[PDB]
Symmetry: C3
Subunit: 299 residues, 3 copies
């Protein structure tokens, strides 16, 4: 599969496999985890997306069971992980309330646990998982810079940051943030006009798109009819067209697909087969927003 | 009429004549087009505002009929035109959907058609007509820079851009964008407090105000009574006061007036006769917003 | 009381005494004004917050009655004052409408009146009281710079500015704006996520928080029960906990407390006795917003 360079130091697969449901599968054995990773690799999807909090702080260890039992498998993938969200589950069950923690001490503890749980000495990309209204940017930026200098983390980014959050944390760091993982799909189009995507495009930062299929709501009329029509014109399913709509954007959006289904992994690359011309991009955008683009103001 | 320098390379009349309705007139003859331009020139209004899309891609050619039959008339005016909006009309009737196109190829084709249609070798100002959610800023900025270097376009700006759109496109260009054509009037006051006008004021960019009379809704109670009162105090009509309210702002707003009526052209300059002191500016602003300005927070 | 350096030139008390109600007290005698200032000084609160408009342009003169009758008292305090709001009261009663005035002439007249009314040759901090939709930033910034160079004003800031207002005025000034006085409390939490506080945090500018108790609405269920519980755990009242919630933020927020009650002045410093850990900060923030913080987007 085509590669995307987020920076001179980090290259992903153009589509990323989200592992947030890996702990929900009835099968969490090393063998089934390896099978899922091997199905991705068969399609050239090498990038796995994790977070400390997934599975109530167990999804990384479940991935680790796979990796620790298959020597050589970690060298074939990039691992994205995240920290900053503290819910009273698993190892954080002492917690009195759901909160964010962007402190140097917490980031280091979470990274040490990610490395322990997945059986590796480095993660390819670490994201601050949510913007913290209590962030000390100086402290957080120093911790993130030291994690890169150490080699434990190849690159750093953020998730769900607004442009002003991104700007504040980048002002406190020597290393450049290489991504912002944000909701983007035909059902979530605000970032295209509200400044979120423009900011990233001006900074030459690729976003990672979460819920790129619209979070299950798109498949459950006019939008779906057009996705199915284009798919049938190009020999792919409506799912591939909804991902290709993201891939078409010149901001170089990196979709994160989160299925436990080996047959949807088998077809995930079909999005790269879609030719999405400018007019088709607008047809889908207009059906999704439910109204025509603004025409001449003088009318 | 008083001149306004948008830059060292482009100077307009302080009021601009919008030609978006020129094709709606029952009379589209060269003679009637010349009459309208000559009525503007009689009031010192030298700047004409066009767009490729006006008249379903025919308004420029209708202006051209006037200019081509009156040698010397083009040298007396500045021409603003715009591109980026593609509706299925006239030469774009093959189009499947209403969309934006900011590609180098489309901008060049639209500019070549503007020059052909108006019978000139240059336009004074070219605007991207709407912010394109699919913009490639690098590509668009290269096309706009080459159009300036070529002499085909004296200066470039945008229309309906948010500050983040303006910032993204300017980051990709060597030439400075000299304006943003946005809605501003007593019925459209959001830009005064929402950051749109502050951004332009910090960049020392004059906006062009579209629908400066409120788009026909202002004339169709308290606001109109005050405009009529001030006009009767200063020997002008309520229309001149509504334009002078824009002219008073220190951001150096350039109103675009869009009438086919020779008698409203004859009086358009009366706005420059209005003395609009700070208190009068606030009286009108407060009547328009329908509530007092925020006073001391401690109360 | 702990000091806060807004800059190399200006240091306040970490809590500020707002004098906006000083004219509402039945007692406005010099003796009662001195008593209030002496109650603050007894708690290490040295910073007094004024504005030209307070008391309909009489509150400064009422403070002055106190200061002029107590030689040496002005040297013990810092004075913050503000201008820019013109209401038809007192010396501005000729005014036809409520408006803003950020002109050099008005700022100078207001500062000269603040110095005359309080009987001093300098103010520690001058704020533009409200963002003016008619601001000429070049003119206002020149007036503010000259006021600092003159020694009449030790430092300048703003009040109720949005980030774009702050950015515009700072672009026109040589001196750095040292604060933005904005609404911040458990009932006013928008600035924590909407970019207002992030902007100030990136610029290393401390905000001053007005209505830090929520403007009387907080004391008049779940939020109050938690403030009372934490206070009873730490030997202080719920008021001290609501102020400590602001003091905990790493942006170094400076609360402005506006009581005429000598017994609430006597206890105002109790906020500095509160230990507010990250989880407690989130518990209060969550009770105030009325919903959990956003958890993992993948769920």
């Amino acid at each position: 599969m085509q590669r995307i360079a987020l920076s001179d130091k980090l290259e992903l697969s153009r589509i990323v496999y989200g592992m947030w449901r890996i702990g929900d599968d009835a099968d969490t054995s090393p063998a089934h985890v390896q099978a899922k990773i091997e199905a991705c690799l068969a399609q050239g999807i090498t990038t796995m997306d994790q977070a400390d909090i997934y599975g109530g702080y167990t999804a990384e260890a479940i991935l680790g069971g796979g990796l620790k039992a298959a020597p050589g498998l970690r060298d074939k993938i990039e691992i994205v992980t995240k920290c900053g969200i503290v819910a009273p589950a698993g190892r954080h069950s002492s917690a009195r309330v759901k909160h964010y923690d962007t402190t140097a001490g917490h980031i280091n503890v979470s990274v040490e646990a990610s490395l322990r749980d997945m059986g590796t000495d480095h993660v390819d990309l670490l994201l601050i998982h949510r913007p913290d209204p209590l962030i000390d940017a100086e402290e957080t930026g120093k911790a993130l810079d030291a994690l890169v200098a150490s080699g434990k983390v190849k690159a750093v980014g953020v998730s769900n940051f607004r442009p002003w959050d991104f700007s504040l944390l980048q002002s406190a760091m020597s290393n450049r943030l290489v991504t912002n993982q944000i909701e983007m799909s035909l059902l979530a189009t605000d970032t295209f006009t509200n400044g979120d995507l423009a900011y990233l495009q001006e900074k030459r930062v690729s976003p990672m798109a979460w819920s790129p299929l619209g979070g299950g709501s798109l498949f459950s009329g006019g939008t779906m009819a057009a996705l199915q029509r284009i798919g049938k014109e190009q020999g792919v399913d409506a799912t591939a067209v909804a991902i290709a709509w993201l891939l078409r954007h010149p901001a170089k959006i990196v979709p994160v697909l989160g299925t436990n289904n080996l047959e949807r992994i088998r077809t995930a690359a079909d999005a790269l087969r879609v030719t999405m011309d400018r007019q088709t991009w607008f047809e889908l955008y207009t059906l999704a927003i439910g109204k025509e683009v603004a025409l001449e103001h003088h009318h």
